[PDB]
Design a protein around this nucleic acid. Structure first.
Lengths: 88, 324, 188, 177, 66, 87
RNA sequence: UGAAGACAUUGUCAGGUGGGGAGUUCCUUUAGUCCCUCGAAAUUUGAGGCUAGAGGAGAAAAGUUACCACA
C-alpha cells in the first residue's frame, strides 16, 4: 500500500473531465483568491461540514444554494477582473 | 587636588581615565561621590501593570496571595508597583504568563508618560529591543491605532514578538529596519518614540563594560549616530494632525555629547521644532552651557534623571513639536 | 409556553446537582451546568421581554416563572455547595444582565430580583465590585451585550449605571433595596 | 504578506471551529467599518485588523518580522497548528472550559497534561475528544487542549488518570527570552 | 526490496565507517583548536568581547588573518 | 542540579596565574555537537569565561570581558572544572 | 428645486511594498585608493563611490541535522 501521489499515475478521462493537464514540476502554477463575502460563505460551509449533513432537506438545499450563490458571485468578480485586465 | 582625585577615583572604582574625567566634570565634588555610589549599586526592581488584562490593585492582591512583597511606588505612577521580596520567581507566576504584568525599569516608564498617546493614533518606536515601551504605549491607546515596532537586530526581535504577543497587543507590526532609513519607508506619523543606542553610562549596573570599554573614538561615532537617528524623527512626523503629535527623545546616558548636544543640533538644523514642558512630574533642568558652547534656552524645559537623587537609571527626556 | 418549559427544566437540573449524594457524586459523575448557564444567559433577554412572568413546599412544580427565575438565579450565583467558589466573569455578566432585567420587569418580580442581588454582593463583594468603580475597570475591548457565551461578554469594561435608572423607578419600594444594595456594598 | 487561498482558508477555520463557538464574531464588521483579515508570513498566519493590514503592505515581504496576532503555523504537510499566541482570541469566546486547582495550575505552566486530581469544575457535552480551553479560579487563560475521555469515561478512570490533554500552554512565552 | 537487500548485506560495514568519521571529526576539531593555540601563543590584536559567529566560521576567520 | 557548574579554574599562560572566573557559555564540544547544545563540559571543550577580574588590556586600550578557554581536565571524574585561557 | 458641505472626493508628481498579473532566462566575503561625494568633529572620523584576492528550467517546491514521535 502506497500513496497515490507518489505513484506517477496518468490522469483518466472519466465522467469528470480531465481538462488541460499541467505538467508535473515544470512550470506548475496555482491560483490566488481571498474575497470578503465568498469567504463569509466558506464560514457558512465549514460548520455545515463540521456539524454534518442536515436531516432537513429544505435547510440542506438552502445552504447548498448559498454556496452556489457564493460561487456565482466569485465567478462574476473573476470576469469583472478579466474585463478590467483587458481594459488595462 | 583634582589630579589626585582622578587617579584615586579611577583606582578604587575601576573606571577608565577618560570617562571618570568626563563624569567628574559635570558634578560638584561631593555630588560626584554620591553619584558613584549609586550607579555602581544595583537598582530596585519595578513592575508595570498591564492595564488591558488587570489593574493595579487586583494584581497587587494576587501577587501577595502568591507571597510577593509589593509596594505601590510613588505618586508619579498609577501603573508602577515596586517589589521587595518574592518566594516564587517573578516570571513563574501565572499572572506573568498571561501578561498581567511585565518586568521593567523605572527609566522605561517615563518616556511613555512623556508621550501622551491617544486612541486611533499612528505611533512608532525606532528601538524597542526589550519591548517594554511598546507594550506601555499600547496600554494607553486601549488596543487601538497602530505601532510600528522597529529594531535593527533579529535576535532582539524574538524577545519583542514573545513579549508583545504575551501581553495581548494585537496592534503592533515589527520591522527589522535601520531607523535612519525609516522616514523614506513610510513617514507621516503622529507620536514617534526614539530610545537611541547610547553610551550606557546611565546604567552601569546592567552593563558594567562601560567602566573601561568606552574611549575617545566611541564618544564621536555614537553621538554622531544619534543625530541621523534624531533628524529622522522630525522628518517622519506630521506637521499637522487631527490630534497633535509629538516626538520624544530618550537616552540611557548621562554624557553631555550624547545628551543636550544632539537636541541642540536638531533644533538648529530644523527650525520647525519647538520644545515645551515635558509633563514628567519631577526632574532636573538641562544645562544651557557646558564647555564654552551655548545651547538655546529651550533646554531648561528638558528633564534629566540621576541615580543619586532617584533610584532610577541615568536618563534624558525631551519632547518635540512639529510645525511645518 | 417554551419560556416556562425551559424554566420548568431549569430548576429541575439545578435540583439534581443540589442532591447531597449527587454533589458527593461530583467526583462520581460529571454533572456540569456550564452548558446550561449559557442557555439562561442567552435567554435572559427573551425572559425580560415576556410579561407573562406572573400567573395564577415544592421545588419544581411552581407555576410562575418569576420564582422559577429566582430559584434559577439563586442556584447560579449562590450555590449551596461551594458558595464562594464561583468564576468571576460569570459574576460580572449575570449581574450586568440583572441590571438589564431590572429595566424590563414588573414590580413584584423586581424586588425579589433586587432582594436577591444584595445577597450576591454581600457574599462575593470585591470580585464583582470592580464593575461599579471605574478605576477598577479593565480596558481590553469594548463590551458586547449580545454574546453566545457568558465569558464572551467582557463586563469588566462597562460600569453599572442602571442603579441610577432604578432611582427613577418607584422610590417607596424599589429604592429601598437600592440603598440596601449600596449600603452593603460600602460595608464591604 | 500573502492572504490565504481557498484551500488554506478551510483548514484554518476548521481547527478554529473545533475550539470556537461563534465564528461570526471573529469575522464581523466593527464600528469603524473595518474588519479582521487573515494574512500569512513565512508559513505562519496572522490575525489582523484590515487597516493595520493595509499599512503593513509597505514593509518588504522577506524583511517584515511579525504583524498583529499569530493564529498559528502552516505545516509542511498542509495541516494547521495553534500556538499560544492564538489564545487571547481563543479564550475570548471558547466553547468548553476547564478549571484547575492551584496545585494543578502550575503543572500546565510547566507543561503536563491535565490529570483528574487537579480539575476544579468541568463542563458537560464533551465527547471523548473535544477541544477545551483551561483557566484557574480567576478565569485567567492558561492554555488549550483536547479532552482525553468522554463525559462519563473521563471520571471513571483513576484519580491519577489523565482527564484532558495538553496542546499548548502559556509557559512557551518563557522560552524565547 | 532492492534497497532493503543492499543495507542487509552492508550492515556492520555502515557502522564501521560511521565510527571512523566521527573520530575523524574529533581529530580535526582538536587539531583546529591546536592551530588556534599556536596562533595566539606566537602573535596577537583581539576585541574586548568575543565574536558571535559560531565555530568553524569564527576559527576560519582567525586562520584567514595569517 | 548537582551536575551543574557555573565557575571554572582557568590558567593564563602569560603571568602564570590561575583564578576562578564564571563560565558565560559553552562554545563547542568536539565529542558531540548534541553535547554542545546542552553545554556538556568534557575534555577539550571550549567555553567563554569572564576575564573582567584579570583586566587584560586589549588593543585600542580596552578591557576584555570574554575569552576562549579550553577545558583540560575530565570534570566527570574529578569534581573541579579546570581550563586554560587561549591567549 | 432642497440637504451635506469647503469635509471628503478628485487628479498629477516624488516614493515604499508587491508569494498577485504580463513578459524575461548582479549580489556575498575581504582589503586598499584615506583618492572623489554626502555627513560629523576647534582639524580627525563615519556613510556612499572607485579598484582588486575568493564564490555562484527556476513559487511549483527542493538539500541538511550525532534532533522529536511512529513503523
Amino acid at each position: 500500500v502506497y500513496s497515490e501521489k507518489e505513484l506517477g499515475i496518468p490522469q483518466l478521462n472519466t465522467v469528470t473531465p480531465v481538462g488541460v493537464t499541467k505538467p508535473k514540476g515544470k512550470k506548475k502554477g496555482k491560483v490566488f483568491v481571498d474575497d470578503r463575502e465568498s469567504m463569509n460563505t466558506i464560514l457558512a460551509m465549514v460548520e455545515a461540514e463540521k456539524q454534518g449533513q442536515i436531516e432537513s432537506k429544505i435547510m440542506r438545499a438552502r445552504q447548498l444554494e448559498e454556496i452556489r450563490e457564493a460561487r456565482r458571485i466569485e465567478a462574476e468578480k473573476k470576469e469583472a477582473e478579466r474585463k478590467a485586465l483587458l481594459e488595462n | 587636588y583634582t589630579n589626585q582625585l582622578l587617579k584615586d577615583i579611577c583606582a578604587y572604582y575601576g573606571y577608565n581615565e577618560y570617562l571618570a574625567e568626563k563624569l567628574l566634570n559635570l558634578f560638584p565634588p561631593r555630588e560626584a561621590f554620591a553619584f558613584f555610589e549609586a550607579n555602581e549599586t544595583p537598582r530596585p526592581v519595578v513592575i508595570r501593570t498591564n492595564t488591558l488584562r488587570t489593574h493595579r490593585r487586583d494584581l497587587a492582591q494576587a501577587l501577595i496571595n502568591r507571597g510577593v512583597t509589593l509596594e505601590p511606588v510613588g505618586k508619579w505612577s498609577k501603573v508602577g508597583l515596586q517589589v521587595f521580596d518574592s518566594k516564587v520567581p517573578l516570571g513563574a507566576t501565572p499572572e506573568y504568563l498571561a501578561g498581567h504584568y511585565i518586568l521593567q525599569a523605572a527609566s522605561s516608564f517615563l518616556p511613555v508618560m512623556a508621550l501622551c498617546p491617544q486612541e486611533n493614533e499612528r505611533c512608532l518606536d525606532m528601538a524597542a529591543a526589550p519591548g517594554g515601551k511598546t507594550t506601555h504605549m499600547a496600554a494607553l491607546m486601549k488596543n487601538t491605532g497602530v505601532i510600528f515596532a522597529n529594531d535593527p537586530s533579529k535576535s532582539r526581535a524574538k524577545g519583542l514578538i514573545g513579549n508583545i504577543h504575551r501581553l495581548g497587543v494585537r496592534n503592533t507590526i515589527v520591522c527589522n529596519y535601520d531607523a535612519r532609513e525609516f522616514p523614506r519607508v513610510i513617514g507621516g506619523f503622529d507620536r514617534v518614540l526614539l530610545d537611541a543606542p547610547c553610551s550606557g553610562t546611565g546604567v552601569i549596573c546592567k552593563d558594567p563594560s562601560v567602566k573601561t570599554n568606552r574611549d575617545a573614538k566611541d564618544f564621536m561615532q555614537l553621538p554622531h549616530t544619534q543625530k541621523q537617528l534624531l533628524l529622522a524623527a522630525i522628518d517622519s512626523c506630521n506637521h499637522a494632525s487631527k490630534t497633535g503629535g509629538y516626538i520624544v527623545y530618550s537616552t540611557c546616558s548621562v554624557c553631555v555629547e550624547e545628551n543636550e548636544e544632539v537636541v541642540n543640533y536638531a533644533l538648529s538644523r530644523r527650525p520647525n521644532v519647538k520644545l515645551v514642558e515635558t509633563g514628567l512630574p519631577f526632574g532636573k533642568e538641562g544645562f544651557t552651557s557646558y564647555m564654552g558652547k551655548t545651547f538655546h534656552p529651550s533646554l531648561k524645559l528638558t528633564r534629566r534623571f540621576y541615580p543619586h537623587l532617584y533610584n532610577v537609571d541615568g536618563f534624558f527626556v525631551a519632547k518635540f513639536k512639529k510645525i511645518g | 409556553d417554551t419560556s416556562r418549559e425551559s424554566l420548568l427544566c431549569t430548576v429541575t437540573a439545578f435540583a439534581l446537582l443540589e442532591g447531597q449524594d449527587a454533589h458527593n457524586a461530583r467526583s462520581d459523575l460529571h454533572l456540569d451546568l456550564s452548558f446550561f448557564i449559557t442557555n439562561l444567559y442567552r435567554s435572559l433577554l427573551s425572559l425580560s421581554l415576556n410579561p407573562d412572568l406572573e400567573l395564577g413546599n415544592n421545588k419544581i412544580n411552581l407555576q410562575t416563572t418569576t420564582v422559577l427565575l429566582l430559584r434559577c438565579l439563586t442556584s447560579v450565583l449562590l450555590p449551596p455547595w461551594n458558595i464562594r467558589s464561583v468564576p468571576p466573569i460569570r459574576l460580572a455578566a449575570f449581574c450586568k444582565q440583572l441590571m438589564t432585567l431590572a429595566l424590563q420587569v414588573p414590580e413584584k418580580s423586581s424586588q425579589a430580583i433586587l432582594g436577591l442581588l444584595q445577597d450576591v454582593v454581600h457574599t462575593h463583594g470585591r470580585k464583582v465590585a470592580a464593575l461599579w468603580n471605574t478605576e477598577e475597570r479593565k480596558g481590553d475591548g469594548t463590551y458586547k451585550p449580545l454574546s453566545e457565551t457568558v465569558e464572551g461578554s467582557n463586563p469588566f469594561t462597562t460600569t453599572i449605571w442602571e442603579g441610577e435608572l432604578l432611582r427613577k423607578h418607584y422610590c417607596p419600594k424599589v429604592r429601598e433595596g437600592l440603598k440596601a444594595m449600596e449600603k452593603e456594598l460600602r460595608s464591604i | 504578506m500573502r492572504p490565504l487561498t481557498d484551500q488554506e482558508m478551510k483548514i484554518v477555520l476548521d481547527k478554529l471551529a473545533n475550539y470556537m463557538t461563534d465564528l461570526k464574531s471573529l469575522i464581523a464588521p466593527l464600528e469603524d467599518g473595518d474588519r479582521y483579515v487573515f494574512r500569512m508570513q513565512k508559513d505562519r498566519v496572522y490575525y489582523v485588523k484590515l487597516s493595520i493590514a493595509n499599512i503593513a503592505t509597505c514593509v518588504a515581504r522577506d524583511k517584515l518580522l511579525s504583524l498583529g496576532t499569530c493564529l498559528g503555523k502552516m505545516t509542511k504537510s498542509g495541516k494547521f497548528r495553534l500556538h499560544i499566541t492564538a489564545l487571547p482570541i481563543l479564550a475570548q469566546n471558547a466553547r468548553y472550559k476547564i478549571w484547575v486547582k492551584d496545585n494543578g495550575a502550575q503543572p500546565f505552566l510547566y507543561g503536563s497534561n491535565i490529570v483528574k486530581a487537579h480539575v476544579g469544575r468541568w463542563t458537560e457535552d464533551c465527547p471523548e475528544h473535544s477541544g477545551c480551553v483551561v483557566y484557574n479560579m480567576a478565569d485567567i487563560p492558561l492554555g488549550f487542549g483536547v479532552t482525553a475521555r468522554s463525559t462519563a469515561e473521563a471520571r471513571r478512570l483513576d484519580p491519577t488518570g489523565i482527564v484532558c490533554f495538553r496542546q499548548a500552554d502559556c509557559g512557551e512565552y518563557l522560552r524565547d527570552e | 526490496a532492492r534497497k532493503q537487500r543492499d543495507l542487509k548485506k552492508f550492515g556492520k560495514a555502515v557502522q564501521v565507517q560511521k565510527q571512523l568519521e566521527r573520530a575523524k571529526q574529533k581529530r580535526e576539531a582538536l587539531d583546529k583548536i591546536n592551530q588556534l593555540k599556536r596562533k595566539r601563543a606566537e602573535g596577537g590584536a583581539l576585541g574586548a568581547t568575543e565574536a558571535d559567529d559560531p565555530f568553524d566560521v569564527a576559527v576560519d576567520n582567525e586562520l584567514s588573518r595569517d | 542540579m548537582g551536575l551543574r557548574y557555573k565557575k571554572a579554574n582557568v590558567t593564563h599562560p602569560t603571568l602564570n596565574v590561575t583564578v576562578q572566573l564564571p563560565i558565560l557559555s559553552v562554545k563547542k564540544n568536539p565529542s558531540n555537537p548534541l553535547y554542545t547544545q546542552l553545554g556538556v563540559l568534557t575534555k577539550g571543550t571550549i567555553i567563554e569565561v569572564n576575564v573582567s577580574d584579570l583586566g587584560i588590556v586589549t588593543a585600542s586600550g580596552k578591557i576584555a570581558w570574554g575569552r576562549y578557554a579550553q577545558i583540560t581536565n575530565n570534570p566527570e571524574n574529578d569534581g573541579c572544572v579546570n581550563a586554560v585561557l587561549l591567549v
